Design a protein around this ligand. Structure first.
Ligand SMILES: *[C@@H]1O[C@H](CO)[C@@H](O)[C@H](O)[C@H]1NC(C)=O
Ligand SMILES: *[C@@H]1O[C@H](CO)[C@@H](O)[C@H](O)[C@H]1NC(C)=O
Ligand SMILES: *[C@@H]1O[C@H](CO)[C@@H](O)[C@H](O)[C@H]1NC(C)=O
Ligand SMILES: *[C@@H]1O[C@H](CO)[C@@H](O)[C@H](O)[C@H]1NC(C)=O
Ligand SMILES: O=C(O)CCC(=O)C(=O)O
Ligand SMILES: [Fe+3]
Lengths: 181, 362, 643
């Protein structure tokens, strides 16, 4: 058994001035709503501000890649559609392995607009962050950005830019497995 | 591992947290040391048995606590009465659990308890016994583990290897055994040996033991849970009980003895069938009729025993039978009530309360 | 169904920022409507689901011997079957549950009436002045210290198009608008127009009480990240949640009697209702109602002398048979009867489980408080008059605020007084030497170094006790930590001349390490200048006390454990965080104690090449905002060392 996906949002990454590929996410709009609704709204840019032309500001190797802060580039901003912060909904799902998306927070009940794509099984973050997605396709592209040259502050030397980001409708919610990738 | 065990006088030398003892046992097992690992694994088993015995003793006073009659004005507010009784029972439990030596150590995590209920340590125990020239104990541990997991290929290979050795053919014993199962086996042997009084006495001794074990197991299923959602009052205390009920449903089937590799289906019905036959063969119908009525109660759709009951009813003025010796025994009625109520509650709960946001992967 | 209010509020705020007046007015009105719609839906579902499935109580069912194992199971099954039926009804009625929850900032914004400020600005810019003055009056009543809205109301008053009765309040509860108006009419020697208003106030009070009691069945309140270590059984979790719900239901009598125009809730609300009613009825000429109201007031306070005199006068004027014929009102009887049982249950829970409860009523008899709880209240009362006598002697022997609330006994032997408040350039400041010896310095340092496996690690006393129980850290170190925390609490309470008992809020054993690989060009402090009560805004030289900050803390104390490092000095700063006022040098045995208000902004300098070990302690004077982990720690210590 596993959770059911309901929506699919896709990204189009770019390191430097060279196309790399496309990452397609699978979001659980029934297990944890109001967190998918934030991610979907920012992806399509319904309310003006969105993830377009954003940047990944933490490329910590063998741990995770974190991005989504569009207010400023240093990684200490970000606002959601429900004001500024909104509380954690439920910790039903865990970081089962690589390619699982979750909401990065700076305390308790401080969900904003920053996420991170897990790359190794982080069992010590369970019960602290809320997981709302899974990387369905393009698992070889997320590993391209991770192996880029980075300085001491974990900021990549070459900028990573989300060129495009949209949304694909799903006609029939299909379950997935809690294994990896 | 259980010969030198006493719940009251437990040696204070080996009182350690269960998790620490298990960790030391596993660490020494991986370090190619055998005797010390055997001792530590046995100590961990004894600690688990002590923990279960202590938890099954502090639920004896609290449940059997006749509540005092309250004031006159309190009778008009039922919610306050119910939850005041709940607070008093919780207070009694909390006070009682502070006096026992097994509750003053570091309590184990849920995954370790789940592993212990799955009889996992017995694999290590049998291998360590084998590597220490303890073939009878090794085969006993292998058989004990096989009793719970009838689908483990490695255990079949090991057990077949054990049978190949000479002499190791009559030491097949269960390390985790219960009194009622032994009493039932002795009663069955006596009944097959055309002995009636001994069989009747053994069955009548075995029934209350099974009921006591059943109610202790039911009481031991109301444990903690893992917090992952934050709902309202009723909606959150109606999920803890759903998990508790999922645990409770399997207590009846986790206690049934296994004979010949096949669990004896309809345990209580078989007990009452044996009792009815034995009582009838002695022409003591005063006790024979209620056993037949109870067997009807547990198995409604029968053929031969219904015609039996017809014979008893129509010929009631032949041996002497009042209108009261035609009703089931109170214990059978209570058992039927509890089992049917739990099944009905689970059937109702898995349609209106359980969430539907997970499916089957294809 | 109805979209979440916070999304609509965000849309309206954005529209206000851009300058789209129709957008902001539409969004704010939609948000205000949706909040009330959701509240009404919750109330309706809860009331209907409670009315559909009554508890109905268990029958007589004598226990009987030798059959007491299955009877308990049957009783539990009945109780949980009823519970499951009610839960199913609620799950069917409510629907999607994500829309009923919102952050604390949004709730605070809705409590302070900010949409009405936005709406009044928008309505003025839209030329709809009547609604503009209505919104301005609503906001002004919400916040009485706002002078700009008073000026705006005056400007609206100068321009024609309104009246004095045109002003309307759209947020205050109906039972509160009728009480004040009736009281004002009665104070103007006009009893004829005062009685119907007070009667309507009583009716609406009972209705609003029954409505507010049905909204207290909410989620359990874990202490931050303490839901990951929660190991309560079924029947303990049920009682924890029920006790919290009962506390919330009992804390509504102090919410229905509070108005934003005042800084203090009304005293004895319902008995005051009956007192004004009986006075007005006597003034009018109606006498049976007067004696009935006097009796139903003496029901609550049966030892009053003025009301007894009034009742005696009324009875003397009337006949004995009539005065014996009429009694109190039944609604007050039922209200008091239910509240007494709830109070009894809460006092039992406080006595046994150590869950605090502060009585919101003054008419509660002494027969509902247990015997052990009664002695503690007596000792707390005696120490209040002993401290008061000490203060009077100092004043009669005579900067007042620096002599009558400082200079305590310092009970424990071996403690000196290095610097008082005068030498620290401020008020409510102290520095003490030699609270603990060097052996305890080493013990605590090793306890906080072993438990670890700039940087930062802190361990609380409860976690230290649990780790000592498991076997990772020594147990005597945890016991010593417990003892030193209690000793510092007692010393701090005694020095500052406190009469109300001082409770615990938080404790923390911190350890700061400086990494020398990133020591090149570090121009920031280890701890920025802050205030433990407010949240600081140095741009305007003021703080605001809000939920994002722990506003319930009253006193602070810091105890140091070593003195071999570079930097790490503790310094006090004035309101603008640029000028140092005092500085202390860490050595173990030093205790820095101060009040955590806005008069003592502090900070920690940068730590380079060493370790800084210290214990940080914060105390409260409010028994409700106490530490919930100290009861469990005390229970652990009781059963570990004196079992
Ligand atoms: C349970 O413990 C209490 C503790 O005082 C005792 O009074 C009571 O008799 C005990 N119950 C049984 C059945 O022994
Ligand atoms: C218990 O079972 C008997 C017979 O099966 C039935 O008559 C009785 O009503 C049941 N009791 C309850 C409480 O369901
Ligand atoms: C007093 O008031 C009640 C109703 O409030 C009324 O029925 C009664 O007639 C009044 N008594 C007199 C003397 O007016
Ligand atoms: C802590 O104080 C108690 C006094 O109640 C004393 O018995 C105990 O020995 C003390 N522990 C340490 C480590 O000083
Ligand atoms: O450790 C210190 O000196 C100050 C700590 C403090 O004031 C705080 O934690 O708010
Ligand atoms: Fe501070």
């Amino acid at each position: 058994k596993g959770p059911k996906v309901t929506v699919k949002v896709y990204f189009d990454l770019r390191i430097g001035d060279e196309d790399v590929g496309r990452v397609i996410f699978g979001l659980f709009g029934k297990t944890v709503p109001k967190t998918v609704d934030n991610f979907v709204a920012l992806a399509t840019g319904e309310k003006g501000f969105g993830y377009k032309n954003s940047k990944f500001h933490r490329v910590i190797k063998d741990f995770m890649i974190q991005g989504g802060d569009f207010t400023r580039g240093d990684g200490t901003g970000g606002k959601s559609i429900y004001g500024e912060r909104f509380p954690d909904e439920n910790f039903k799902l865990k970081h089962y392995g690589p390619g699982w998306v979750s909401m990065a927070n700076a305390g308790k009940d401080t969900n904003g607009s920053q996420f991170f794509i897990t790359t190794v099984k982080t069992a010590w973050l369970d019960g602290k962050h809320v997981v709302f997605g899974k990387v369905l396709e393009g698992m070889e592209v997320v590993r391209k950005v991770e192996s880029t040259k980075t300085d001491s502050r974990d900021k990549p030397l070459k900028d990573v830019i989300i060129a495009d980001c949209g949304k694909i409708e799903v006609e029939k919610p299909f379950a997935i497995a809690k294994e990896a990738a | 591992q259980y010969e030198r065990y006493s719940f009251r006088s437990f040696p204070r030398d080996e009182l350690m947290p269960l998790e620490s003892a298990y960790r030391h046992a596993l660490d020494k097992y991986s370090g190619e040391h055998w005797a010390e690992s055997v001792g530590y694994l046995e100590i961990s088993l004894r600690l688990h048995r002590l923990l279960r015995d202590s938890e099954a003793f502090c639920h004896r006073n609290c449940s059997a606590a006749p509540q005092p009659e309250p004031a006159a004005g309190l009778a008009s507010y039922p919610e306050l009465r119910l939850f005041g009784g709940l607070l008093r029972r919780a207070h009694c439990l909390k006070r009682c659990k502070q006096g026992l030596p097994a509750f003053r150590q570091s309590q184990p995590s849920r995954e370790v308890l789940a592993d212990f209920q799955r009889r996992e340590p017995y694999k290590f125990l049998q291998f360590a016994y084998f590597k220490a020239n303890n073939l009878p104990k090794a085969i006993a541990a292998a058989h004990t583990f096989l009793l719970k997991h009838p689908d483990d290929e490695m255990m079949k290979r090991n057990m077949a290897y054990y049978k190949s050795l000479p002499g190791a053919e009559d030491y097949i014993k269960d390390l985790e055994t219960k009194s009622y199962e032994s009493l039932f086996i002795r009663a069955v042997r006596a009944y097959n040996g055309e002995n009636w009084r001994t069989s009747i006495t053994d069955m009548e001794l075995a029934l209350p033991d099974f009921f006591k074990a059943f109610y202790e197991c039911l009481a031991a299923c109301e444990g903690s849970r893992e917090i992952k959602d934050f709902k309202d009052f009723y909606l959150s205390i109606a999920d803890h009980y759903v998990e508790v009920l999922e645990c409770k449903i399997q207590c009846e089937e986790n206690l049934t003895p296994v004979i010949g590799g096949y669990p004896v289906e309809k345990f209580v019905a078989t007990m009452y069938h044996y009792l009815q036959f034995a009582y009838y063969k002695l022409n003591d119908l005063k006790n024979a009729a209620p056993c037949a009525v109870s067997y009807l109660l547990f198995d409604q759709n029968d053929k031969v025993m219904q015609q039996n009951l017809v014979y008893y009813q129509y010929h009631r003025d032949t041996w002497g039978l009042s209108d009261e010796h035609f009703q089931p025994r109170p214990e059978a009625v209570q058992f039927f009530n509890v089992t049917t109520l739990q099944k009905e509650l689970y059937d109702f709960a898995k349609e209106n309360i359980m969430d539907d946001d997970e499916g089957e992967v294809v | 169904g109805m979209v979440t209010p916070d999304l609509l509020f965000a849309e309206g705020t954005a529209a206000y920022a851009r300058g789209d007046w129709p957008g902001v007015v539409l969004s704010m009105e939609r948000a205000l409507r949706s909040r009330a719609a959701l509240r009404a839906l919750r109330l309706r579902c809860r009331t209907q689901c409670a009315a559909d499935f009554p508890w109905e109580l268990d029958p007589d069912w004598s226990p009987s011997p030798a059959q007491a194992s299955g009877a308990a199971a049957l009783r539990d099954l009945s109780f949980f079957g009823g519970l499951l039926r009610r839960a199913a009804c609620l799950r069917r009625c409510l629907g999607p549950p994500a829309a009923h929850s919102l952050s604390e900032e949004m709730e605070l914004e809705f409590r302070k009436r900010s949409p009405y400020n936005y709406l009044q600005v928008a309505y003025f810019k839209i030329n709809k002045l009547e609604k503009a003055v209505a919104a301005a009056h609503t906001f002004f009543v919400g916040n009485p210290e706002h002078m700009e809205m008073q000026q705006n109301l005056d400007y609206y008053q100068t321009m024609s198009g309104v009246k004095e009765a045109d002003f309307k309040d759209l947020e205050t509860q109906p039972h509160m608008q009728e009480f004040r108006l009736g009281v004002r009419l009665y104070s103007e020697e006009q009893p004829q127009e005062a009685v119907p208003h007070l009667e309507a106030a009583l009716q609406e009070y009972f209705v609003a009480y029954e409505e507010c009691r049905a909204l207290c069945e909410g989620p359990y309140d874990y202490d931050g990240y303490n839901y990951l270590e929660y190991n309560a059984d079924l029947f303990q979790a049920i009682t924890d949640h029920y006790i919290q719900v009962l506390n919330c239901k009992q804390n509504c009598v102090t919410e229905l009697a509070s108005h934003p125009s005042r800084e203090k809730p009304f005293e004895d609300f319902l008995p005051s209702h009956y007192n004004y009613l009986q006075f007005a009825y006597y003034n009018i000429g109606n006498y049976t109602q007067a004696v009935e109201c006097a009796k139903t007031y003496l029901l609550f306070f049966p030892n009053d002398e003025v009301m007894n005199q009034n009742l005696a006068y009324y009875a003397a004027m009337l006949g004995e048979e009539h005065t014996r014929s009429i009694g109190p009102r039944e609604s007050a009887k039922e209200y008091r009867q239910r509240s007494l049982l709830e109070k009894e249950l809460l006092f039992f829970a406080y006595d046994v489980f150590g869950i605090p409860f502060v009585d919101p009523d003054s008419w509660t008899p002494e027969e509902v408080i247990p015997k052990r709880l009664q002695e503690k209240q007596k000792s707390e009362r005696e120490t209040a008059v002993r401290i008061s006598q000490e203060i009077g002697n100092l004043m009669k022997e005579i900067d007042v605020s620096r002599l009558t609330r400082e200079g305590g006994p310092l009970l424990y032997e071996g403690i000196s007084l290095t610097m008082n408040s005068k030498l620290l350039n401020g008020s409510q400041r102290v520095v003490m030497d030699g609270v603990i010896s060097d052996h305890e310095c080493q013990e605590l340092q090793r306890l906080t170094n072993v438990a670890a496996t700039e940087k930062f690690y802190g361990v609380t006393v409860f976690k230290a006790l649990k780790l000592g129980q498991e076997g990772k850290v020594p147990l005597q170190s945890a016991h010593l930590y417990y003892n030193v925390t209690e000793k510092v609490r007692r010393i701090m309470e005694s020095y500052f001349r406190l009469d109300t008992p001082l409770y615990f809020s938080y404790s923390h054993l911190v350890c700061r390490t400086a990494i020398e690989e990133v020591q090149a060009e570090r121009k920031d402090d280890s701890h920025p200048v802050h205030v433990d009560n407010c949240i600081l805004n140095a741009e305007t030289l003021v703080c605001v006390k809000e939920p994002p900050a722990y506003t319930f803390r009253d006193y602070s104390a810091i105890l140091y454990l070593n003195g071999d490092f570079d930097g790490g000095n503790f310094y006090f700063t004035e309101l603008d965080a640029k000028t140092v006022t005092a500085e202390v040098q860490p050595q173990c045995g030093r205790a820095v104690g101060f009040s955590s208000g806005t008069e003592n902004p502090h900070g920690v300098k940068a730590v380079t090449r060493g370790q800084r070990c210290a214990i940080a302690l914060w105390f409260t004077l409010d028994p409700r905002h106490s530490e919930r982990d100290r009861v469990q720690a005390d229970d652990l210590v009781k059963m570990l060392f004196s079992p």
